[PDB]
Symmetry: none
Subunit: 509 residues, 2 copies
């Protein structure tokens, strides 16, 4: 109190203690002593200790949290031109803490710290000019400030420059400039810089495409628990891009990415369960992750969830919920959901049949090139029952679907060519289309091919081959069963014995 050297020793001691105890990963008991020493050192006038003691009070570390007490000591340090304290005052005005919200004063504090070459001041001013925070938005001015912090190595400013030159939202897109700053961020261990550098290698933006290098940076970022890097690393394993294909490592990383809420990771993880790719087959686990992604707007997940309600796989069968999820994806423009919703209305299973909505959605999906939608809309146009009859449009869509090996379109085009009734006879191409559809398991085509062998249509008449084909399709097509019983009346026991034992493989060649 009165001894001058005692005063010198006490304050110099409190400053040494505050700086040393602040750096320690301390417990709740050691944090109270840290506050005790920094209080004495802040009271003595040491600017750095006033900044540290204000930080403790702001974070509630070892002392009751108080935004206004923190501002008091940051003000005393700022009065000594403490650069970090000045940044902290700007944040309080920017966030409206203790004092009222005041963006112009936040900018003024940050600019005062920028005179001292503080990288937080540089960064926050770059953010302010990019988002229009108390200043007119000027992305080029944002780059000026962000470059100042980036050249001093601040990774957050480097990632902002990398993203800006990557999107082109404010300045011209420059992939190579983006790679420059993203690499500098990655070389310092920043997960967001490492992820974006891997994206650069993966797509070849600003650098030569290299999957092996993308895996290298994806993995360093994924091991820091960055969700989007865990997803892309899972994709490189699934596709075998830059690394050996490993469905288990894909599911390993998709699980961590799905847990953090990445919708594509959840959808991919659901496929892994439904199919058994990299995980044990499980319908409930698949629907669990499909729902997680469908609730975020993932169209493919909404469609898979809508199908799971249609047949009750992994969940209770619910035609009402199936239409709700199929429609959300169909309205998003997913062609395969537009077809499934159209087929649901066209068949009328679990809900009322509605051919107007069926034709409406079949046309939407056919126009996007969905093969099975083109087969349905081709026969609707050709029949002309629920729509005006149009043979040109019918054959247009039927041939387009048959071009992509549509088993349904092939079987019907073959039936038309073989009958030669509603169209000109084209038996040779008709039997060929019939054989192609029969190989894909279509038993209507098998019955039609058996009809050709029974009556010598293009093929040489062979009742043995006809019975064998009718027998194969008998459990699935009612005409095949009736045609098999009729042939059984006309064939001898020896012929029945050969026909039953016939391998029908040669009949489809």
């Amino acid at each position: 109190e009165e001894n001058a050297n005692k005063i010198i020793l006490d304050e110099e001691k409190a400053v040494i203690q505050c700086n040393e105890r602040y750096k320690t990963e301390n417990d709740e008991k050691g944090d109270e002593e840290t506050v005790s020493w920094c209080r004495k050192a802040a009271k003595s006038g040491n600017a750095e200790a006033q900044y540290l003691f204000g930080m403790l009070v702001y974070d509630g570390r070892g002392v009751q949290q108080d935004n206004c007490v923190a501002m008091l000591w940051w003000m005393k340090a700022a009065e000594q031109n403490h650069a970090k304290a000045l940044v902290m005052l700007g944040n309080l005005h920017r966030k409206g803490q203790c004092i009222a919200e005041n963006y112009p004063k936040a900018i003024a504090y940050w600019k005062r710290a920028a005179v001292q070459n503080n990288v937080w001041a540089y960064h926050n001013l770059g953010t302010a000019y990019y988002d229009g925070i108390g200043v007119d938005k000027n992305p080029h001015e944002a780059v000026r400030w962000w470059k100042k912090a980036a050249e001093l190595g601040f990774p957050e400013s480097q990632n902002n420059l990398g993203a800006l030159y990557n999107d082109g939202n404010g300045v011209d897109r420059d992939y190579q400039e983006a790679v420059f700053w993203y690499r500098k961020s990655a070389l310092q261990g920043d997960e967001l810089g490492q992820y974006n550098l891997g994206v650069a290698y993966y797509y070849g933006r600003g650098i030569k495409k290299d999957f092996s290098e993308a895996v290298s940076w994806y993995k360093k970022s994924a091991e820091q628990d960055y969700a989007q890097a865990q997803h892309n690393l899972g994709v490189t394993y699934y596709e075998g891009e830059g690394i050996k294909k490993d469905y288990a490592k894909a599911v390993y990383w998709w699980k961590k990415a799905a847990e953090q809420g990445i919708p594509q990771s959840q959808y991919n993880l659901g496929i892994a369960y439904e199919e058994g790719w990299g995980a044990e087959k499980n319908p409930e686990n698949a629907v669990f992750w499909y729902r997680k992604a469908a609730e975020q707007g993932h169209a493919d997940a909404q469609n898979r969830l809508g199908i799971a309600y249609r047949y009750g796989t992994g969940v209770r069968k619910n035609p009402a919920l199936s239409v709700k999820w199929l429609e959300k994806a169909a309205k998003q423009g997913l062609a395969r959901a537009q077809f499934n919703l159209g087929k649901t209305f066209y068949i009328g299973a679990g809900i009322n049949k509605n051919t107007d909505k069926a034709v409406y959605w079949f046309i939407k999906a056919a126009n996007q090139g969905f093969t099975e939608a083109q087969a349905y809309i081709g026969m609707i146009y050709f029949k002309g029952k629920y729509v005006a009859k149009n043979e040109k449009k019918g054959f247009y869509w039927l041939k387009k679907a048959a071009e992509k090996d549509s088993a349904k379109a092939q079987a019907f085009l073959g039936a038309l060519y073989i009958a030669g009734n509603e169209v000109k006879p084209n038996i040779k191409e008709g039997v060929a289309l019939t054989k192609k559809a029969a190989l894909q398991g279509n038993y209507e085509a098998q019955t039609l091919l058996g009809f050709c062998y029974e009556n010598g249509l293009e093929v040489k008449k062979d009742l043995i081959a006809a019975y064998a084909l009718y027998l194969s399709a008998s459990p699935h097509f009612d005409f095949a069963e009736k045609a098999r019983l009729d042939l059984e009346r006309k064939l001898s026991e020896q012929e029945i014995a050969k026909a039953i034992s016939v391998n029908t493989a040669k009949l489809f060649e």
Copy 2:
């Protein structure tokens, strides 16, 4: 064999073909007209060869065939039949029977033009205006179209009228347009009757006269011309040249909307929403709004955007609201630029975007939209989302108040009364506070009540403080707490006296 029988058979066939061609018969008399015209065409009659060729071309009483028609038009053309030459030119122009051949088409029309045929004149005019077989030349098109117009051809009179009305290829001359359009309108042509009414409605090339405009609009609309149906509806809607009749306006706008006139569809939608000329129907208004919006109508796009914001006539959807408001803001509609700016500024349903909000406010304010001038003035003054500029902020805040904006007057008066962020000017501030309080602004009525409760500038009338806070209590939370606080210190006599005083305290 018999010479007198041959002459009498030819003359009877010629007479029959001419008389049976004028008559509009059915399938019974049609297949009998071709029999008499074939007999007269086989005899060598040039006119009957042309008529029989037309019968085969149209397929009236015989099988339709382009080549058989050309056949008899050639026999007629060898006799220099005018119309038959025009028909031979059209076949080569269109590529019927023979291959497409623009030069031969021009050559046939020019041969028919030598004999002063209006169709040859008109088609040669169209040929020079479209560049069909000849180099494009509007002046040469006017030459041919005039020759057919001097002979009374309506379609040539309309083309000249439209050219001189639009100044496309010649100097725009509204008088010259009216000159040709009148010749067309007097013959009963629906297009000439419409444009003559347009001239009377706007005073272009003729003295403005709404009663004549209605007269010609009605004659063109009765022939189902869609654009005349719209303008005739406007005259009924505005009472210009005829007694105002909203129901008669909606009547013609329905016919014009079904034909696809965007403005008719828009006006019809307003009728269904507001109830002028029809019973109110919210869903039917949105139907016609969308119909006009799809065709690029700016006001319809803005109307459909507002309807999508508040769900008025359709399911509420902020995403689609931003789409339709944006398409109208792109077209420079100042009202939609403000609505899109306010949508981005509030962030209700979509993401708040102050950058786009400021961008559209500046754009709408430069067109004189006072509401946008008020929003941008408070933005340049607050200095939160832009750099603070009080000089620019007061420039827009005054213009809004100088044109009676309740938004600006309530805030600009709040600054003058407080005297905190600006020098105290409370005398003029109370005057601005009264004006905005007149127009339902519960905020200005609240700040004016603040001057009465605390005795700020105005004579301290605490009873009037309850009367001003009363109207705003169920609407503004502060005025509700301001009317609740004054209620704790007022007696029942002063409560009953305050809830009845005429606030128009202004």
